[PDB]
Amino acid sequence: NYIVPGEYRVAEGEIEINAGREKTTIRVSNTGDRPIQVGSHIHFVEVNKELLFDRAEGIGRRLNIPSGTAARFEPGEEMEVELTELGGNREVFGISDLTNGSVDNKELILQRAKELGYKGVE
């Protein structure tokens, strides 16, 4: 009974994040010469044009990582990440201006991605 003022006594167990949502693993390569770090809640298809991956598999999704954390890609680095599904209304506005509406509009998102040179539109 050493007292640490304000200390936690946390319950037993683990917290599952993004419970009940579909998970998807994809390979992503930083084709650029500068580091890219991606946060938990950016619409994955709208990341830096120099990240090469199957852009279709980023639509309606974000990184399956604890809220407020990031995946880092060093220059030239290729690695796998796990994605989860966006929730709420599944709409995205702004960011890279690829969606500005429902994430259901896959053709329109990919058409804009390809036109602006977001790498990996099949």
Binding site: P5, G6, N18, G39, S67, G68, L86, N89, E91
Partner: protein
């Protein structure tokens, strides 16, 4: 993907079933529920979630369900519960307790808690958030008293005084229309909520009522002005008509009556009994029996809180200095021994623990400490856990029942007693955003940030010349809520309905928010949250022993308290 509960609590603050120690006390609070959706927690910073198109909505204008301010991941401690939520503020009021962010991409977002372009962020992860403290026994003696109150989490001062005049140095009284007008104008410069008490003394209605019409928010009956049957009766007749609260400091000397005479004058009407234990004042020796009655809203002042080894020696001498007593006048020695009683101070600890005394208060600068109402509330709860054990009502090994009973004593119960709980006293939707953030290590000792009307008024913060604000010296400082005209929009002057209907704010040029006192005459003990017990309190006239349900109430004084020498430089 899963996070263990230690890392989860480090990142976002604790979640359901996690416990947190209150400062260096033995008291543990447990998270009862959490409004979050695990994985969609809101947070602010580099690469974090509250960013445009992500946890921040880039579409909605301010009017379209967007907050002015989100407190992320708060551990709320309130009479309404001990639980985890985001707190949304707009137009200076709490508009949502729930889950903030962006409905575009997040599950479970409370519909009026959108983070948008218009939203400021305060990170409350790992903080305890409470309502601002409501101190209803304030003597306005020295303006330096306001920062003292703010530094210990007090946001409302109810009481009276004109500064260090003897009337004000003894009594919570701003007497008469002119003094009340002058102190309402002074109040324009005080960065805290204020309500002013008039003199509850007279044998005609008009001299008392004209104070209510001038802008007083209530009355104080004090023995120093004559706590006679007539002054008690006229004050309560005025209060019943005006819908304001009466506080009473009764006739200690029993000059015109004993306790039963004061209760007969009250005649079942509603009254706030100040320092009900009686060291601070009242019918010797049995005043504390007031706390048993259904029409009495009973408060303690703080120097008796809780009962310690130095209490009696300190109080006998404090009373000698306060009253100019002479040790060679036997009548002065008999008076002091009739008023300073270990039997009633010890019973006062247990009456708090049982929910029979409903409220705390300071008695700031008259016979009590402006910055120690919150501090001594938790010291008392800690002492009672050590001496009486967990309350029967407790579950899961937590002190949540005792923590709700005790937080009620300095938040919601004084607000209800004063007729101001529509505006302040709890973290509820629709109430004024007076919020206190605490590091658990400093809980009840030194507030981190005090929010007044949705803007920070006071903060423990460091070197103003530094690259970042955390370097030494970290001290209590007034913030932008106190500066310029913002002091008007972030604070409330509480006033009688009649003074408001008669246009006193416009007459005096008051720019502060005007709060209406109301719903004070139709309440009783049953309305005191978690502290609603009526009972026959017997105080033995010979031994001063206190009995409830045939059982003597006694406990030992303690040699040591938590929330003391670990924290304070003096």
């Amino acid at each position: 993907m899963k996070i263990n509960r230690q890392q989860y609590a480090e990142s976002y603050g604790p979640t359901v079933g996690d416990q947190v120690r209150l400062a260096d006390t033995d008291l543990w609070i447990e998270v009862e529920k959490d409004y979050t959706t695990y994985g969609d927690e809101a947070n602010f910073g580099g690469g974090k979630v509250l960013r445009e198109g992500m946890g921040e909505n880039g579409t909605y204008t301010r009017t379209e369900n967007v907050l002015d301010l989100l407190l992320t991941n708060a551990l709320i401690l309130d009479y309404t519960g001990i639980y985890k939520a985001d707190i949304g503020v707009k137009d200076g009021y709490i508009v949502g307790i729930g889950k903030g962010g962006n409905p575009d991409i997040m599950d479970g977002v409370t519909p009026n808690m959108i983070v948008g372009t218009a939203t400021e962020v305060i990170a409350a992860e790992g903080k305890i958030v409470t309502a601002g403290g409501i101190d209803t026994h304030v003597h306005f003696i020295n303006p330096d008293q306001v920062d003292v109150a703010l530094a210990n989490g007090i946001t409302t001062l109810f009481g009276g005084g004109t500064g260090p005049a003897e009337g004000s140095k003894a009594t919570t009284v701003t007497p008469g229309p002119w003094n009340i007008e002058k102190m309402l104008k002074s109040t324009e410069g005080l960065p805290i909520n204020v309500g002013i008490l008039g003199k509850g003394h007279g044998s005609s209605i008009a001299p008392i009522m004209e104070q209510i019409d001038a802008g007083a928010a209530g009355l104080k009956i004090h023995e120093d002005w004559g706590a006679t049957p007539a002054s008690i009766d006229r004050s309560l007749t005025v209060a019943d008509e005006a819908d304001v609260q009466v506080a009473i400091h009764s006739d200690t000397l029993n000059e015109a009556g004993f306790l039963e005479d004061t209760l007969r004058a009250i005649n079942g009407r509603v009254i706030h009994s100040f320092h009900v234990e009686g060291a601070g004042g009242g019918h010797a020796p049995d005043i504390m029996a007031m706390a048993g009655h259904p029409n009495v809203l009973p408060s303690s002042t703080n120097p008796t809180r809780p009962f310690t080894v130095n209490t009696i020696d300190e109080h006998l001498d404090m009373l000698m200095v306060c009253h100019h007593l002479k040790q060679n006048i036997p009548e002065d020695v008999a008076f002091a021994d009739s008023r300073i009683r270990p039997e009633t101070i010890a019973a006062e600890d247990i009456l708090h623990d049982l929910g029979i005394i409903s409220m705390m208060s300071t008695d700031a600068l008259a016979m009590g400490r402006a910055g120690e109402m919150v501090l001594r509330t938790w010291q008392t709860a800690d002492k009672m856990k050590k001496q009486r054990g967990p309350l029967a009502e407790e579950k899961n090994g937590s002190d949540n029942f005792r923590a709700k009973r005790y937080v009620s004593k300095y938040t919601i119960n004084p607000a209800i007693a004063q007729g101001i709980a529509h505006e302040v006293g709890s973290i509820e939707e629709g109430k004024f955003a007076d919020l206190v953030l605490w590091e658990p290590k400093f809980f009840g000792v030194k507030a981190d940030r005090v929010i007044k009307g949705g803007i920070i008024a006071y903060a423990q913060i460091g070197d103003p010349s530094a690259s970042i604000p955390t370097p030494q010296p970290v001290m209590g400082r007034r913030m932008y809520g106190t500066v310029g005209d913002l002091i008007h929009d972030t604070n409330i002057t509480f006033m009688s309905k009649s003074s408001i209907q008669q246009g006193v704010p416009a007459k005096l040029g008051l720019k502060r928010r005007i709060g209406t006192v109301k719903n004070c005459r139709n309440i009783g003990k049953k309305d005191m949250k978690w502290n609603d017990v009526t009972t026959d309190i017997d105080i033995n006239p010979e031994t001063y022993e206190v009995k409830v349900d045939g059982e003597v109430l006694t406990c030992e004084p303690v040699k040591e308290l938590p929330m003391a020498q670990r924290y304070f430089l003096f």
